[PDB]
Structure 1
Amino acid sequence: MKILLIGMGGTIASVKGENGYEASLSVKEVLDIAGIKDCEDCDFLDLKNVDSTLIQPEDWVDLAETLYKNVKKYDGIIVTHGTDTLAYTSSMISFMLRNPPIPIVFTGSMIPATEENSDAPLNLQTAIKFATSGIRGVYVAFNGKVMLGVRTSKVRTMSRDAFESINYPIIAELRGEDLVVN
């Protein structure tokens, strides 16, 4: 029931102005604007606020250190991330944190959390439900599916169904309020 949410930026947290500026929400702001009010005991940590296209290998070191110092203190961790290099990060973190004691769930959205039709609420609810499972490891939640993080690829560039599990079964799939694993 105790969850840590770590922000890295991405479209999910994106906020655009008419002045031509591009700003970014913190993780807590993302959850609140996405309308997740059922997050009972949740902490928040803002590690980065970048377009994921900017991600470099040094960022994976930072993220892994951060994860390593929190895996014992939480029952689950969620990392919000841009979709562009999300599967790269989830892959590298999988090699860096061999055998996490908890679920570590990467997610994001194709449409900013600030828009009315965003996929952010579905993705966050999915990640949250899975961070409460007892299933240890590194995963990606997107479009109602939970996929093994080291078997995930971005497959579509302009769709809500942006990710797939490649050559491996999907871990779980949302059906109502239920994550189903078969």
Structure 2
Amino acid sequence: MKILLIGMGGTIASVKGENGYEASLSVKEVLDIAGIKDCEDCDFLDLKNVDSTLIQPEDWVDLAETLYKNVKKYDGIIVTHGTDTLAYTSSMISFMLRNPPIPIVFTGSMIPATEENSDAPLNLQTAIKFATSGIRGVYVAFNGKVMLGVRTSKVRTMSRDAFESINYPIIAELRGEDLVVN
């Protein structure tokens, strides 16, 4: 029932202006604009609002501490993140939060949630479905697939199918409203 969404920024939350500025949506605003209206009993925490290319190892320490202080309070946690370093973060958090009590699911999107053809809604709904599965650990949700976080790599730079599980089976895959684990 109870999910925490933690925002780190990234393309999913990006908003650019004709006058050249670049702004960012809080994680609650991302979900709203993505049209996710059935995420009830969800809390929101904005940890960062950065292009993930800026991420440094200090950010992993801060994220891990924040995760540690929430894993007992929620049944699942979702972290929205830019795709450029998403797999470094999911990998480091896997080593830092050794075997957590709940699913922690990193996700993002190749197209800002503000665009009408965005992959944000699919990725958020996949993450939300898995964060309720009772399957503990650190994962990445992307393009309808759930992948072990410490086995995930960004494989494409300009395609919706940006991430793959390398040398390890995909954990679950979306078919309709159902995550299938085999």
Match of 2:33 in 1: 33
Distance in 1, Cα, partners of 2:155 & 2:99: 27
Q: Deviations over 1:113-166 (max 9, x none)?
A: 000000000000000000000100000000000000000000000000000000
Q: Deviations over 1:67-108 (max 9, x none)?
A: 000000000000000000000000000000001000000000
| Structure 1 residues without counterparts, runs of 5 or longer | none
Distance in 2, Cα, partners of 1:4 & 1:56: 23
Distance in 2, Cα, partners of 1:160 & 1:106: 16
Equivalent residue of 2:129, what SS? helix
Distance in 2, Cα, partners of 1:46 & 1:19: 26
Distance in 1, Cα, partners of 2:99 & 2:154: 24
The count of aligned residue pairs is: 182
Could you tell me the percent identity over the aligned residues?
100
Shift of 1:40: 1.0
Q: Deviations over 1:43-73 (max 9, x none)?
A: 0000000000000000000000000000000
Equivalent residue of 1:92, what SS? helix
Equivalent residue of 1:101, what SS? coil
Distance in 2, Cα, partners of 1:83 & 1:47: 16
TM-score normalised by length of structure 2: 1.00
Shift of 1:112: 0.1
Equivalent residue of 2:115, what SS? coil
Distance in 1, Cα, partners of 2:54 & 2:134: 33
RMSD, matched Cα: 0.2
Equivalent residue of 1:141, what SS? strand
| Structure 2 residues without counterparts, runs of 5 or longer | none
Runs of 4+ in 1 over 3 A off after TM superposition: none
